[PDB]
Design an enzyme around this catalytic site. Sequence first.
Site, PDB file in Angstrom:
ATOM      1  N   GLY A 135      38.379  40.206  28.098  1.00  0.00           N
ATOM      2  CA  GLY A 135      38.523  41.126  26.991  1.00  0.00           C
ATOM      3  C   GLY A 135      37.189  41.282  26.262  1.00  0.00           C
ATOM      4  O   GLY A 135      36.149  41.306  26.901  1.00  0.00           O
TER       5      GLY A 135
ATOM      6  N   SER B 219      36.533  36.980  33.744  1.00  0.00           N
ATOM      7  CA  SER B 219      35.566  37.505  32.784  1.00  0.00           C
ATOM      8  C   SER B 219      35.423  36.572  31.589  1.00  0.00           C
ATOM      9  O   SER B 219      35.056  35.403  31.756  1.00  0.00           O
ATOM     10  CB  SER B 219      36.010  38.907  32.412  1.00  0.00           C
ATOM     11  OG  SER B 219      36.272  39.586  33.636  1.00  0.00           O
ATOM     12  N   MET B 220      35.679  37.054  30.383  1.00  0.00           N
ATOM     13  CA  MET B 220      35.498  36.174  29.229  1.00  0.00           C
ATOM     14  C   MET B 220      36.364  34.913  29.327  1.00  0.00           C
ATOM     15  O   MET B 220      36.000  33.857  28.772  1.00  0.00           O
ATOM     16  CB  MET B 220      35.801  36.933  27.957  1.00  0.00           C
ATOM     17  CG  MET B 220      35.559  36.146  26.687  1.00  0.00           C
ATOM     18  SD  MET B 220      33.987  35.279  26.554  1.00  0.00           S
ATOM     19  CE  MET B 220      32.749  36.568  26.842  1.00  0.00           C
TER      20      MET B 220
ATOM     21  N   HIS C 257      31.896  38.291  36.383  1.00  0.00           N
ATOM     22  CA  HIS C 257      31.224  39.564  36.619  1.00  0.00           C
ATOM     23  C   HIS C 257      30.330  39.920  35.439  1.00  0.00           C
ATOM     24  O   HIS C 257      30.294  39.228  34.408  1.00  0.00           O
ATOM     25  CB  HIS C 257      32.224  40.694  36.915  1.00  0.00           C
ATOM     26  CG  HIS C 257      33.141  41.077  35.779  1.00  0.00           C
ATOM     27  ND1 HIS C 257      34.271  41.840  35.982  1.00  0.00           N
ATOM     28  CD2 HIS C 257      33.094  40.830  34.450  1.00  0.00           C
ATOM     29  CE1 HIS C 257      34.892  42.029  34.833  1.00  0.00           C
ATOM     30  NE2 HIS C 257      34.189  41.438  33.882  1.00  0.00           N
TER      31      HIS C 257
ATOM     32  N   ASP D 104      32.543  41.973  40.992  1.00  0.00           N
ATOM     33  CA  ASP D 104      33.628  41.016  40.786  1.00  0.00           C
ATOM     34  C   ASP D 104      33.507  39.886  41.812  1.00  0.00           C
ATOM     35  O   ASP D 104      33.344  40.131  43.011  1.00  0.00           O
ATOM     36  CB  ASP D 104      34.992  41.707  40.903  1.00  0.00           C
ATOM     37  CG  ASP D 104      35.308  42.652  39.720  1.00  0.00           C
ATOM     38  OD1 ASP D 104      34.546  42.697  38.731  1.00  0.00           O
ATOM     39  OD2 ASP D 104      36.347  43.349  39.787  1.00  0.00           O
TER      40      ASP D 104
END
Lengths: 182, 174, 180, 180, 179, 180, 180, 182, 180, 180, 174
Positions: free
Chosen positions: I57, I86-87, I111, I158
């Site tokens: 996010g 991600s985060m 990523h 990714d």
Amino acid sequence: VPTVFDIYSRLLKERIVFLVGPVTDESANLVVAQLLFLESENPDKDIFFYINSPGGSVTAGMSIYDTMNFIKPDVSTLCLGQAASMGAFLLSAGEKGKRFALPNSRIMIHQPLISGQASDIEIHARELLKIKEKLNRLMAKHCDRDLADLERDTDRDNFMSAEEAKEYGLIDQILENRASLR
Amino acid sequence: DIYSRLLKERIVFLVGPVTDESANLVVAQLLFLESENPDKDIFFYINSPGGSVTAGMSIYDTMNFIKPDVSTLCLGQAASMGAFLLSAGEKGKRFALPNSRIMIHQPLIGQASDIEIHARELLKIKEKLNRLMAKHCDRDLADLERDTDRDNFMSAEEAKEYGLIDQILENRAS
Amino acid sequence: LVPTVDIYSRLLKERIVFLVGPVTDESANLVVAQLLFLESENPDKDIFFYINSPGGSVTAGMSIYDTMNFIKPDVSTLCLGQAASMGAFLLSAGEKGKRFALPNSRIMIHQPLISGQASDIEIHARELLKIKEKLNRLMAKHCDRDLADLERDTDRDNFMSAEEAKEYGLIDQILENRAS
Amino acid sequence: LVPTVFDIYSRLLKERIVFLVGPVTDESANLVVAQLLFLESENPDKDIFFYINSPGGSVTAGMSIYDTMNFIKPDVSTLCLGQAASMGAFLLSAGEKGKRFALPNSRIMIHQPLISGQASDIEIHARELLKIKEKLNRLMAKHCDRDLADLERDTDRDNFMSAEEAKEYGLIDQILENRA
Amino acid sequence: VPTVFDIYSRLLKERIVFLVGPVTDESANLVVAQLLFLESENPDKDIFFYINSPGGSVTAGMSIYDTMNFIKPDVSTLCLGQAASMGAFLLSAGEKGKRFALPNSRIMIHQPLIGQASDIEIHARELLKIKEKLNRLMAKHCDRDLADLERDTDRDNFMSAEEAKEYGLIDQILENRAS
Amino acid sequence: VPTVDIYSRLLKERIVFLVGPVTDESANLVVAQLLFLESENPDKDIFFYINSPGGSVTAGMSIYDTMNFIKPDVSTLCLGQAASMGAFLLSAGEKGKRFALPNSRIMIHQPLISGQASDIEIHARELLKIKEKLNRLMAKHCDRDLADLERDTDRDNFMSAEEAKEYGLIDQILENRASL
Amino acid sequence: VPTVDIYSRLLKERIVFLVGPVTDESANLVVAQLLFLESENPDKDIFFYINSPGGSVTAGMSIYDTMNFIKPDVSTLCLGQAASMGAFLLSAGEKGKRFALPNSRIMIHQPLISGQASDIEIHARELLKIKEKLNRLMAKHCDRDLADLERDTDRDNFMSAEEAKEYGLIDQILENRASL
Amino acid sequence: VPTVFDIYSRLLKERIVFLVGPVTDESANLVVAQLLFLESENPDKDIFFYINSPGGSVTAGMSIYDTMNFIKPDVSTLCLGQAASMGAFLLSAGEKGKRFALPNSRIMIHQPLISGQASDIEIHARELLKIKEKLNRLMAKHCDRDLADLERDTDRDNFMSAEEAKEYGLIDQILENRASLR
Amino acid sequence: LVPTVFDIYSRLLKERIVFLVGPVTDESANLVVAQLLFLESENPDKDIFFYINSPGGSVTAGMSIYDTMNFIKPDVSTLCLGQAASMGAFLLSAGEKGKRFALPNSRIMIHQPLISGQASDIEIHARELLKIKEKLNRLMAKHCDRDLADLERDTDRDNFMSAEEAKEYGLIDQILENRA
Amino acid sequence: LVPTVDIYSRLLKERIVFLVGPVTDESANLVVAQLLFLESENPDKDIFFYINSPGGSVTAGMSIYDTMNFIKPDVSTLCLGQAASMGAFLLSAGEKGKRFALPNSRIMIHQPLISGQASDIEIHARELLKIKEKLNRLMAKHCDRDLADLERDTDRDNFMSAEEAKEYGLIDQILENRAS
Amino acid sequence: DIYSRLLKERIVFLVGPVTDESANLVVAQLLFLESENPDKDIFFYINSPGGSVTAGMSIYDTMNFIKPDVSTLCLGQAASMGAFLLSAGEKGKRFALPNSRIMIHQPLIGQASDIEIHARELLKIKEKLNRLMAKHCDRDLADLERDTDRDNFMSAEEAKEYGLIDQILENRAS
Ligand SMILES: [K+]
Ligand SMILES: [K+]
Ligand SMILES: [K+]
Ligand SMILES: [K+]
Ligand SMILES: [K+]
Ligand SMILES: [K+]
Ligand SMILES: [K+]
Ligand SMILES: [K+]
Ligand SMILES: [K+]
Ligand SMILES: [K+]
Ligand SMILES: [K+]
């Protein structure tokens, strides 16, 4: 709303009442109800009415105005952030001598604005002009000014700094911190 | 096309709502027919529920401006501005078919200052149209104010008695 | 949905040009094109510009205005129905002595209307105010009137009958029929 | 919806008039390209008259017209009517020097490019946008006989100009009031 | 629409006029225009008015009705598919003796249907006047008593071709070029 | 909301949060917490944690005037981000008690916004008054010259915690309770 | 469409346009024009003008195979832009007759797209087959090594006319009919 | 559509018929109508049917197929761009020996796919399986292959290069330019 | 919609378990911040257990949690369940080294940043995005005890990893099958 | 709209946990939280996990699966209504010997489903195929079956009665009442 | 709350459509009531138009699994899965109020291969429910196939004769 009572109920015990955001029937009546309650709790102690509002419904605002004038306690008014249109009308309606603004508040006054058969449009246009006239007369009284001043100064949006509102007669004092009041 | 062919017989139609576009199309046909022959009658057939007052006034003033007599005929209905234009036909040449219906009524539809200006303009329009309809109908302004305060539906015979038309035509036996 | 003999092309032969409905780039340019065409067909004969419009885009209107003044023929104007805002501006811009209205026309004049960052809002506010001044100066000239009158009389919507528009200087004559 | 005479815009094409009206899109720009190529084919020894009333649009669609103007043999005279903003101003200023005109109440506006994924892709498209920004400044300074730094200053935000200001800037050569 | 003239203009050369689908101001007036055109072409020859319509606007229907009776030509009517409500009114309004239906047509008849209290009153009264006039005229078309039509249109009344001939709404049923 | 609710429990530690857009309602909730903590003890610091992209200028001024009005020092802490009015409030914290975490980011810029020319004029003037007043206050918060703030807020100005500290917007970056 | 229609008139000069997105319908219209011009005269060059951001790969291959199939050389001209499949077709023009105007831009990239795993597997494999086949064809068009195209199309690759010429995608930049 | 006749009417005079985009009742019947017209113009001369299609309606495609087989002229087929699903079925239905593809065409075949009471679902499921079976049998005939091959090779999307389609039996020759044909 | 025991998530907070589930938003991130601050206040000498099942996010909302983890006294042990992308992966890898865990069938994904006006503004925001991209790579290399160039290579697109691959990379320390 | 004595909290006292409807991050984590809570209350007593679900997110399901296996208590599973896709996976993951279905339950198994640039489509296709392989290997283990059987039997949707699910190895017993 | 209070009297309601959520809420109440007392009757009041087959089966199998007898009562209506569950009440304790109505009918609702799989599953469901309803009603599968091919509305008395309920209750005088 952080309990500690929820925070706003906690501040109502200190006789603080908030009007925040647009004036509607429901937000107006909740203010009214608090006013009536505080009078019941103690009819002789000041009430502190904090206003941060762009305005809204004229009839809903009038329910607040008339209740403020009806009840025995003095209703002191305080503008934080802004008091525009009906917000400004109500700010200026506080007990004279107890109408306040914080230093970077913004005030604004203007004439009524609105969102069938010609006969009905005539009837509603006449009523709208009566409303415009009554608000100018009431505001002139709050501001200790001539009616002709209010007719001139509400023709279009009239934005005022806190000092300009005090000079206008709309508030009594600007409070930067506790030291103020005089 | 069928309507182009009937224009050759000097027939012009007003069908459906009166808009700037539908009105001006009528205006253009009237001016064309006058250019082709300024002395021969024009036949303006109206089946309309009304619409824009100013668009209708463009037709009305054109009807009165051009040299040809504009005969009017109500088929189906002529309501509001449709009825105004029907009554505006050359006197003696305003007609309705037998099961036509007419209806007349008063006009219909910011800052308080602006609402005042527009309400005043609307009431000026209301009086002007009542005065003009009174003239077409050989009636008084006060009758028209009375009789248009709410929707007032009229049969062909009622419309003739009122003065909005001259004759009801079942067929060419006038 | 046009009848064919199309009618507006047939009337363009009589040097009649219509502006009907809102003034847009496309509706204004079609008028410009007709004006230039008529000038090409005959540069010395009057053109008759019939206006029934509530107004619209100022820059599209200015394209019509400047073409009317550029071309050689006199452009006579006629208000039918209404000429409001840019429509009224264009009605008043017709060749002086040849600006007309039908008797039940309505005219209306008013100041400009508009229906990001403070810097950009500043740039555009200044441009809208320049437009407001230019249109008042120009209308005052068309009407043989003072700028201070136009500034006053356009602060809010100002509706005028055909006779009031004549008294104001916006038109020259009211035409009831081909005998006026 | 165009009057018949045999279509009015086709009729004015016979006079070597080409219009750009409204937003510059691939389809509207190629239509201008097509008309320029046609007029050159019909007669390469006569000027073409490119009338502009446009708020701008796609930069690449505008460059297709720009390069065509410069490619063909005829001088492409430009005229601003109503307005020439963004890519519209670029093309107005690109007319054959000495043959760039404005009507008296037209307005010009110039500014830097605008746009209405992964960081690697944001970088790529951002780099291309700034390349477009520098190229258009270099070409505009060339059109205006001005220093690049002037255009850099003067296109940071929307820059509106009257016809007299645009002439002083170097974007047009002459203001036309009428056929005199 | 195929061309030969487009197909409907070609059939106008045969004095055939169609009413198809909902009756609107625009569809009704296009019919009127064809009737007037055919009368100007020859006011002494019959017109053949083919109706396949569920009904629609009463006032738009009356514009066809009054034109049918106004013009000199006999207006022969023919139902194909259906003639319901105003469609049925127009079918039955044909020149008596010259109103026809194909064998599997269906006819349906019924009463009309669709602010301040004062305005509602005005409009209800007008609708009821419409109701009575329409019953009065249909009884005339069908050579029946007003009271019969009042009874028989209180709710939707579907009729076969034979039933419609019996009621008086049409004169003959045509299976082929019969009669 | 986990319950002990989590935010009321942290309110006991004189922690007040501003998270997400500044609206009339979110701003007034902060005001009420500040007033409450003043009532509980007027001499102990309040810790005002900010993770906000900004929002309404007047709603934010209601927080500002309250911070300056009450007796307690309001220490501010940027976590995540403090943008626009959020950064304004971060910088309004009691000088010496304005902090950010090491990967916090601050952003500053001039005001942004999302009728008749007379009215457009009134609101454009009020917006430029807002721009000037806010630049004047920020310059004071940062102990910098106004012309620096005018220059540095013309477009979005993103600053790391280290950059915001050098600017005068914050006092210290806190990695833990030993970076003090 | 101005009428002589403008595009049919230019078709007489063996000019064919590809404007806007490549779709089944726009691609097939080009195919039909190419086939028609071959029928009219199979030895004279065709001039294929491209201002396109790309579109469907298979629709574009229908243009490609037609270009290579018919006898006439197909000269290509980029105006405005030739992106993705548009740039692919620009580069498929007869070697030596691929051109761009000076402010044209070309862009190249790998394929893009906008159920059960078995089916997702089938379509992913077909898409990677497409990527390889297109890289193989582009390398041939550009007289370059495949590994260069693989590298140079991983993300959007924007090229000026001068850059596209050096790459081997075009042959010459045309300012006018004297830059040849 | 550039007149020169509009371009497609001009190419119909050379007995070229196009199917472009999705197969619908309307696009299919327009193809049918051209086929009938060309037969009327000359029942003995070849017709050239150019196909660039993702497929579409099965019944609409069958109207084309059956008309191609009915009329006297041979219908030669040519894939440009792509022929998928019903596009491929129709491509493979051209006169044997006269089914062609350009070098970078793509072909695809697969089983039917689709966008009440159980009794009705049963009836429509049985019909869908009959359709699947009939198309596999007809395609096997066009491709000169075993029915079991088509059952295997249409279970999921089966994308084919031009050469793969020729080896499959779906087309007869790949044409790069005029020189081709053999 | 949470079972009562007194709420289940509040009940597990008594065990010093904090969840991050679903997208990282300002409000969900500050809720984690609030719980961390609460648990430290209740007992700064006990570990906190931060369970992550998140696709990522907002980067700035994630940094608010990140800096809080490092700020407070307790070791924040992290556990991936379901996924950390991600985060989410950033925060999982930020757990106290030696106390970063994954369940056996959890998956990690890393990523480069993604995003879902005027050229001057595009430049500004593009520059900030690439600053975020470089900072996150520097911090991830720090978490993974890897070279920055490895993270640059491995986060371009990714990059999905099983728990065993994430352990080998340096993002987690140990895989937990059960209480053994 | 829960009755109060709430009912699901009351049944959690009997160590009953429900999964009802689609498997999402939020619905899966609520289950995880209940499992951890029950383990905390008593780590040696069985938990009863009642499943009526059509499946959903694989990663959310894996969070449940790994928690079931991590915690000390045996997790008995019961299918009521249906257990499809990830629901069936979880039903089959219960402690062997303690996986049950009610007599008119329905079970269904199938391969994974999904309801940009070619490079990214490639990365994600490869990940979906890795998931497909992992779930087949894991289900084959739960069912005491061969991988080649699961690969075959999940190629399309495979519906099973309770008795077929027992024969397959997915459950241990069908329970008609508390005497089975 | 009112429904919590009536749960204390061992009353459970099914109201409105059968969904995964509404079904499981019923399942949970049944299991709770059994936990409180496994030997005392439960009263399951059904006013439902039906809904999801699998959600309904979760209730059905729970009714049969738990130790308490589940008495059923139709008020208003029990259609489709509502009627199935009504008929599933403990034999001898299935009831309807006098103006209740029952309705029974057959079940209602990609690649051809997948459509085949799902149609087959739907027909398996159709037969299983007919076999189970036949068992509840002491009727034949062939009667139920016959009588559910289209919507089959039944009065309380018709439902009793069919075997779906045991008694109609006007009041407690059984
Ligand atoms: K008082
Ligand atoms: K006249
Ligand atoms: K002139
Ligand atoms: K040139
Ligand atoms: K007649
Ligand atoms: K303070
Ligand atoms: K070639
Ligand atoms: K054949
Ligand atoms: K820590
Ligand atoms: K376990
Ligand atoms: K039981």
